[PDB]
C-alpha cells in the first residue's frame, strides 16, 4: 500500500517490456522474466515504474506493494546483482569449488556435492568463506539456504555453515 | 529387456575349484523365434511375440498354422511375448539364443508351481494345529474361529481358508546365473525355480537391480 505508492527510478541502459501482465527486464547481467498478479496493473511510466490496484480486489493494495518490491529487486539485480557471503566454522571444514559444482566436507563420511542453478556463480577466495553472486535475490537466498541446511550451526561452538552477517546464540553446559 | 522361454530339466550341482558346491537348476533354452512384432501405431504398445519347440503338423490348428506361416516361422508350442525397453528392436522371424544372458548376473524365473490340489489351512497358511489331547474332540486341524460376533455379522473378505494350493504362476527373482552354454542351449541358475520337470519357464534379467 504505502510501499506501492513509491515509483522506482529505472537507470539508463535497462530495458523493460510489458507483455500483458508479464514483465521482462534486461540490464547488464541477463534477461529476467516474471509473471505478475492479475490484480495489479503496470504502465511504462517513462523514467519510472508505477503500480496500481485494479478495482474488484480487496487485497489489491497488498499485491501492488509486493509487486513494487519485486520490481525493485530485479532492477537492482540487473544493474549490479546480489552477493551473499557464507562462512564455514569448524576444524577440518573445506569449501572447495570447481566449475558449476560446489564440494564441501562438513565432517560427513562422504563428500557433499551441490549443483548450482543457472545464473549463479560461486567463488572461494578463502578455504572457509564462499561468496555467491547472481542476477536475482530470490535464487541466491534459496541457494544459500540450501548450503546452510547441510550443517546447521549449533549453539556450543558455532560450527557449520553460517551467514557472514548473522549472530549465533551460544550456550554452555551448566553442570554436566 | 526381453526374456526367454525355456524348459526346466531337473536339478544338479556344480563343484567349484575352492570346494563349495552350488545347486543349479538346468533350463533348456533353445532358439526362440520371433513370430510377431507389436508397435505403438497399431497395438498401442511395443512387444515381441516368440515361439519355441516344435508341434505335430496334424495337431496345430489352421488359425495357428496361418499365423506362423505369415511370419515364416516353424510352428512351436505355445506363444509368449515380452515388452520392450525402448532401447532395442527386433524383426519378424529373427532367432534369439541364450547367449544374451552371457553378460547378465541376476535373472528372474517365472513358472507354474506344482499343484497340491485342495489343501487345508495348516498346509496352505501355516495355521497352528490345536492340542492333540487334553479333551480335544474332532478339532485337531480345524481352522478355528473365522469371525468375531454379531457386531461384524459376517466373515471378512480375504479370509484365510482351505482351498486350491499351487498350480499358479509364481516368480522367483534375483537368481544368480552360474553358466551359459550357447552351443548346447543350457542356462545354469543357482537356486530352485517354480514348477516340475519339463514345465515351461520364462527367464528375464532381474528388474530389482
Amino acid at each position: 500500500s504505502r510501499v506501492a505508492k513509491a515509483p522506482v527510478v529505472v537507470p539508463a541502459g535497462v530495458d523493460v517490456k510489458i507483455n500483458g501482465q508479464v514483465i521482462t527486464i534486461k540490464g547488464k547481467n541477463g534477461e529476467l522474466t516474471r509473471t505478475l498478479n492479475d490484480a495489479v496493473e503496470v504502465k511504462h511510466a517513462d523514467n519510472t515504474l508505477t503500480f496500481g490496484p485494479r478495482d474488484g480486489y480487496a487485497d489489491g493494495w497488498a499485491q501492488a506493494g509486493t509487486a513494487r518490491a519485486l520490481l525493485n529487486s530485479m532492477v537492482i539485480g540487473v544493474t549490479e546483482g546480489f552477493t551473499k557471503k557464507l562462512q564455514l566454522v569448524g576444524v577440518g571444514y573445506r569449501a572447495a569449488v570447481k566449475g558449476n559444482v560446489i564440494n564441501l566436507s562438513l565432517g560427513f563420511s562422504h563428500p557433499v556435492d551441490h549443483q548450482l542453478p543457472a545464473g549463479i556463480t560461486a567463488e572461494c577466495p578463502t578455504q572457509t568463506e564462499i561468496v555467491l553472486k547472481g542476477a536475482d535475490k530470490q535464487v541466491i537466498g534459496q541457494v544459500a539456504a540450501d548450503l546452510r541446511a547441510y550443517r546447521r550451526p549449533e549453539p556450543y561452538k558455532g560450527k557449520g555453515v553460517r551467514y557472514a552477517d548473522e549472530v549465533v546464540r551460544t550456550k554452555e553446559a551448566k553442570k554436566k | 529387456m526381453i526374456g526367454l522361454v525355456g524348459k526346466k530339466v531337473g536339478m544338479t550341482r556344480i563343484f567349484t575349484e575352492d570346494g563349495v558346491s552350488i545347486p543349479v537348476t538346468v533350463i533348456e533354452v533353445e532358439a526362440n523365434r520371433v513370430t510377431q512384432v507389436k508397435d505403438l501405431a497399431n497395438d498401442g504398445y511395443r512387444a515381441i511375440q516368440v515361439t519355441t519347440g516344435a508341434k505335430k503338423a496334424n495337431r496345430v490348428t489352421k488359425p495357428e498354422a496361418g499365423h506362423f506361416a505369415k511370419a515364416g516361422v516353424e510352428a512351436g508350442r505355445g506363444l509368449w511375448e515380452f515388452r520392450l525397453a525402448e532401447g532395442e528392436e527386433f524383426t519378424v522371424g529373427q532367432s534369439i539364443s541364450v547367449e544374451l544372458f552371457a553378460d547378465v548376473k541376476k535373472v528372474d524365473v517365472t513358472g507354474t508351481s506344482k499343484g497340491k490340489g485342495f489343501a487345508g489351512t495348516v498346509k496352505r497358511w501355516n495355521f497352528r494345529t490345536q492340542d492333540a489331547t487334553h479333551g480335544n474332540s474332532l478339532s485337531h486341524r480345524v481352522p478355528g474361529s473365522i469371525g468375531q460376533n454379531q457386531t461384524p455379522g459376517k466373515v471378512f473378505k480375504g479370509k484365510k481358508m482351505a482351498g486350491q494350493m499351487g498350480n499358479e504362476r509364481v516368480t522367483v527373482q534375483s537368481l544368480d546365473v552360474v553358466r551359459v552354454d550357447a552351443e548346447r542351449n543350457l542356462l545354469l541358475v543357482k537356486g530352485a525355480v517354480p514348477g516340475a520337470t519339463g514345465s515351461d519357464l520364462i527367464v528375464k534379467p532381474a528388474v530389482k537391480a
Binding site: - | R13, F15, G19, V20, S21
Partner: protein, 122 residues
Amino acid sequence: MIQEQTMLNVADNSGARRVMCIKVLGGSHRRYAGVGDIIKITIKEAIPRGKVKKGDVLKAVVVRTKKGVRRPDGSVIRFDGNACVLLNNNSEQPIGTRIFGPVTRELRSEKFMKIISLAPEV
C-alpha cells in the same frame, strides 16, 4: 539344534558336568541355538570342589551338536552328544583351563581364539 530345557555336556574343566539351556540369545523368539551361538544355561550338577556351584545361571557357547553342522560342499559333521563351554556373562571369556573332545572350525569368528587354541583337534 539346542533349545530350552536341553541337556548339554561341558567340554571345559570348570567343574560343571551337565547343564540346562534356559534361553537362546541373539534374537526375539529365537527357537534353537546353532553350532556357535551363545546361550544362557543353569548348572544341574558339578564338582563340589569346582568354582561353579549347582543352581547358578551363566552364559555358555555350544561347541558340539548331535544334529551337526553343514559344510559348504554338502558335507556334515555329527557328534554323539551336545557340549558347550562356560562363560562370564559380562565378557565371553571361557573360564575353563582346558577343553576335551573335538571342536569344529565354525567357531573361528576372530573371537573364539581361546576356544580353538585349547581344542585338541581343529
